[model samples]
Each structure stands twice: as C-alpha cells, then as structure tokens.
Target: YNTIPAGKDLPNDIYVAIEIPANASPIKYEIDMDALLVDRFMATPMFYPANYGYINNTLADDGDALDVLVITPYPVAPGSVIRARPVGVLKMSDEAGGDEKLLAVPHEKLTQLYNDIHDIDDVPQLLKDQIVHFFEHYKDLEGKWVKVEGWENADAARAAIVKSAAAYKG
Candidate 1:
C-alpha cells in the first residue's frame, strides 16, 4: 500500500501509526515488502509516545506522508488509521530538509487531556516540550542531527496540508 494519507476531508479521516508506543517496541513499515518492520532504532526508552503516521494522498517537501503524531487517551495498532484532526504544525528540519509533522489528537477519541487542544498552546507546555525534545535528538541517535523552527497553529497546519493535497498527483 502507498501508506499515503487517504484522499478525503481529513477533518474526519486521518491515518495514524502507533510507531513508538509507551513501553512497546518501535514499529515501522517496509513498504516495498508490505511488511510492518520493527525498528532496531531503539529497543528500549522512556514512555515513548504517539501514533506516528502521515497524511495520505499528499506529499510534502520531504517526500514522505505529511507526518503526524496523534495524541490519544488509548493506544492504536501498527496498521491503524485512527481518525484525527490537526491541532498544530511540528516544524522540523534535518540534513534532508523539512520533514514537519502535524501535531493532532484523535477525533471521536476525545478526552480531557486532549479535548481542548486545537492549538499548540492548548497542549500542555511540558508535553509539547517533551515531544519537541524527542524530535530534536531523534536523528542524533543515528549519528545525525536536526533543528526545529517552532510550532504553528491548526489553521496553518490545515492550510499547509491543503497545498500538499493539491500538489499530490496520485
């Protein structure tokens, strides 16, 4: 499968991955093999977080599924497409260029911890800090380094996706 975000309103349908579940192994896709490959990236770590996936039917400068990190009260499976809504933009850059990820929360999977989050600020400061901290050093774990450009609100993130969706060919 393309692993691309499904072509849709996305306000209702956004695919996600629980790539690094808390206390669980990191999962990844080997698209060419149609396999869910476990990353030797790290076998252990802090309460790793989020359902990492991408916007389908769209392409960003980084040429990957417009990345996403879905915050939820419960966990999802490796092959899950849990519904979500964009809350903010995760501005990031590395040797390859912009690989920004969308910060979001589950749609119908609402909770007090995430219900009010539509802007990066709505997300607790420490939680956002921790998430940013991980991204800043993730590449370092591979002997590379990355830098951040800060955060953007839901509107900006949504607009960015619109451009991406239109740019998509297939």
Candidate 2:
C-alpha cells in the first residue's frame, strides 16, 4: 500500500508480492501500479533464494508462467515508466488448449468478449496489440496447473495467480 524500496545491484525485473486483503476486490480496489513498483523495489530484501526459486519447475506451478493484465493510462512506449489502471486480467494456461491457449486469440474474439460483457466501445488498438503480444510470448513450462512444494492451500492458488499475472507482458 505504500512505497516499495529499491535494492542495491538488483535486476530491474525484480518484483515483490503483496496480498490484497481478503475484503478487497480486484474490481473495486484501486491498484496503484506505481506504488506496487515502488513497493517492489523497497521489498527486495524480503526475497530470499531468488523469490521464485521455490515453485519454478513443479507441475501446476503457474508461478513462472507469464500472463497479461490490461491497464488504462497506457505507457507512452514499451518499457516506459508509466503507471497502470487495472482494466482486465489475463493468464497463461496450458489448460486453454492449443494455440488458443497461447496469446493467439483473434481480435474478433477479444472484441466480441469485451463488447458482450463490458460494453466497451472502440477498444484501443494499442491494448489489442498488447494483448496479442502477451499471449504470443508468454511461457509456461511449469505445466498448466500449479503445484507448490510445501504449501497446499488457498494461499498457493493466490500465489499462482499473482505470479502468472505479474509475468504477463504489456
């Protein structure tokens, strides 16, 4: 909820996981991507043994999988230091089947889904392009399902979702 710290000699891609309180709703909660980023930088010391080392190769471990979350206030450019307003979330699931499981969904399908559910008109071309890019490049070698080493509970599921979502491009 506050600022995340930056660590010395750390990779730019380093991230920290924070739980959204149970009473909070992803839909209702205002996600400050900038705050999250800052928090990530601040929380670097908390990550031991390289953060994701625990769930790297286990089956059902979506921890390493890359999914995408579409946000508003789109970055002016790729890798730009811009904040995001959460719009929709995406995940990379082998369970999705074939290329469709990847980021290969046709623009028509995305358009149809948004139009049917949210009544979002004229979805930005940048958003569409980013969605396609995410799926196309996402990698989920850990298997479709996630399996944590020791913990086997709802928390694990939550971790998988966070990891998968964080890994997403765009």
How far out, in Å, is residue 157 in model 1? 1.0
Error of 2 at 28 (Å): 31
- Model 1: CA > 4 A from native: 3-8, 11-13, 26-32, 43-47, 109-113
Q: Residue by residue across 1-170, what tens digits does model 1's lDDT show? A: 46544534654346554454433454443232555666455423434456676666777877765777887766666656666778888898888877787888877554556566667778878877877887776555564568988888888878777777777887
- Residue 48, candidate 2: alpha-carbon lDDT: 14
Question: What local lDDT does model 1 show for residue 111?
Answer: 50
Error of 1 at 107 (Å): 0.7
Question: Candidates' lDDT values, in order?
Answer: 0.67, 0.26
lDDT of 2 by residue, 1-170 (tens): 22332111111121222222211122112224433222122211111110011111112234232222322221122222211111222333345442111111112322344323221223455644544453343232323432111212223334443444445442
TM-score of each: 0.81, 0.24
RMSD of each: 2.9, 16.7
Candidate 2, residue 50: the lDDT equals: 9
